[PDB]
Amino acid sequence: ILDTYMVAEKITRYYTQDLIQLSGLSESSLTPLVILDLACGTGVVSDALHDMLNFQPKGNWELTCGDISTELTGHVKQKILERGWENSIAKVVDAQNTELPTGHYTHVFAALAFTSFPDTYAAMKEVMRILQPGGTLTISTWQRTEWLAVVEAAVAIIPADLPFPTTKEFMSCMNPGWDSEDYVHSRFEEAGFHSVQVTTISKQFETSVEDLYKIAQPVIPIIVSKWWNQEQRDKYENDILPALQRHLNETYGENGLVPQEWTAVFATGQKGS
Numbered sequence: 001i002l003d004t005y006m007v008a009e010k011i012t013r014y015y016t017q018d019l020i021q022l023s024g025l026s027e028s029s030l031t032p033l034v035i036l037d038l039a040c041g042t043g044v045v046s047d048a049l050h051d052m053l054n055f056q057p058k059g060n061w062e063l064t065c066g067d068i069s070t071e072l073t074g075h076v077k078q079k080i081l082e083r084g085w086e087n088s089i090a091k092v093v094d095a096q097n098t099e100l101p102t103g104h105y106t107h108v109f110a111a112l113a114f115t116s117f118p119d120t121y122a123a124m125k126e127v128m129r130i131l132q133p134g135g136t137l138t139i140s141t142w143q144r145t146e147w148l149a150v151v152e153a154a155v156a157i158i159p160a161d162l163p164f165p166t167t168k169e170f171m172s173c174m175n176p177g178w179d180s181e182d183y184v185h186s187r188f189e190e191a192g193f194h195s196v197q198v199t200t201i202s203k204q205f206e207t208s209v210e211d212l213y214k215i216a217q218p219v220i221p222i223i224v225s226k227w228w229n230q231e232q233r234d235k236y237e238n239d240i241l242p243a244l245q246r247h248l249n250e251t252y253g254e255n256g257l258v259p260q261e262w263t264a265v266f267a268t269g270q271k272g273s
């Protein structure tokens with residue numbers, strides 16, 4: 001689990017500054033700040049919060065870093081000790097059942113996580129419960145990644161007529177709609193948030209062929225489970241990663257850098273006073 005997430009955090013860190021800006025955190029009048037990094041992964045939002053809030057003492061604001069994964073939580077637990085984040089606690093938190101206190105947080109952040117929750121309605125209700133009156137929820141969700149297009153190119157050089165999902169189909173297998181501004185906006189209002197703002201932001205970067213291969217590796221079995229039949233899996237499932245190796249090496253080289261543009265929906269809203 002953790003090795004894959006160390007590859008992924010090189011990318012998700014590019015989306016944290018806009019999340020924090022959209023939240024209004026810098027201008028917030030709520031004090032002291034009491035912040036949750038929900039589904040924190042390796043903690044990239046927490047990294048950015050400690051950079052922004054490094055003009056102030058540790059006692060003047062509080063941070064909880066919560067994730068369902070014990071392995072990812074342990075990584076953040078160690079980062080807290082290493083870097084001296086004395087105001088911060090990392091612990092296992094299920095977004096659908098947080099066990100966190102009612103009316104506690106001034107700000108909840110959930111970066112690139114809501115589509116992973118089997119019951120997003122339970123998670124939205126939990127966030128509304130654990131926010132203070134006047135508290136803020138700010139989230140990001142993927143609209144378009146481009147690692148998938150590299151796997152599609154690999155399947156295309158397997159010499160058989162094989163199905164492969166588009167960006168849209170892959171996004172919509174679990175929790176469709178969070179790639180749409182209007183859907184996300186409506187979800188915030190339906191959950192009880194006010195002063196909802198939604199926007200869409202792209203980042204342009206480069207990813208190594210080695211990193212693209214590691215991103216794709218755990219998702220290949222899911223892809224062929226959902227979109228291939230058993231005959232197709234029997235004959236060709238083990239051909240995908242070799243084809244991806246070949247595609248990446250021949251197109252970009254063993255240490256090539258693959259241009260990337262990924263786009264996310266950002267949304268924020270406020271609990272009533």
Ligand SMILES: Nc1ncnc2c1ncn2[C@@H]1O[C@H](CSCC[C@H](N)C(=O)O)[C@@H](O)[C@H]1O
Nearest residue numbers: 012039040041068069094095111112113116
């Ligand atoms: N029910 C749940 N409750 C809390 N975290 C969950 C969850 N289901 C999945 N997750 C976590 O959601 C994360 C999505 S990856 C996003 C991680 C991080 N916020 C970043 O921007 O890089 C993973 O760390 C995964 O373990």
